[PDB]
Automatic annotation (TrEMBL), chain B:
This is Hemagglutinin. It comes from Influenza A virus (A/New York/01/2010(H3N2)). Homotrimer of disulfide-linked HA1-HA2. In natural infection, inactive HA is matured into HA1 and HA2 outside the cell by one or more trypsin-like, arginine-specific endoprotease secreted by the bronchial epithelial cells. One identified protease that may be involved in this process is secreted in lungs by club cells. Palmitoylated. The chain holds residues 420 to 469 of 566 of the full protein. It comes from the Viruses. Binds to sialic acid-containing receptors on the cell surface, bringing about the attachment of the virus particle to the cell. This attachment induces virion internalization either through clathrin-dependent endocytosis or through clathrin- and caveolin-independent pathway. Plays a major role in the determination of host range restriction and virulence. Class I viral fusion protein. Responsible for penetration of the virus into the cell cytoplasm by mediating the fusion of the membrane of the endocytosed virus particle with the endosomal membrane. Binds to sialic acid-containing receptors on the cell surface, bringing about the attachment of the virus particle to the cell. This attachment induces virion internalization of about two third of the virus particles through clathrin-dependent endocytosis and about one third through a clathrin- and caveolin-independent pathway. Plays a major role in the determination of host range restriction and virulence. Class I viral fusion protein. Belongs to the influenza viruses hemagglutinin family. It is found in: Host apical cell membrane; Virion membrane.
Amino acid sequence: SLRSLVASSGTLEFNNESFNWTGVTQNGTSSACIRRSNNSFFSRLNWLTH
Amino acid sequence: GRIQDLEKYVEDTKIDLWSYNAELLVALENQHTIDLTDSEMNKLFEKTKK
């Protein structure tokens, strides 16, 4: 269902939005997903940690 | 998504098949009706001739 709904919309237009995540660590990163030899993550998701 | 796509697809397939059937039905019947009316005149002409 998710694959179908993205496909039918036909656009990846993304607008960043400012959520108030006061109190947690943002921009979490992992060694399983390396961009330019640095640890990174899915560009559109924001990994919150302690 | 998935289930709604199927319901949509079922109706679209069905509509195309009935729309085809209706177009062909009139076309077949109409050609034959015009041919049958012509036939009766020819039969009358031939009957008078005979």
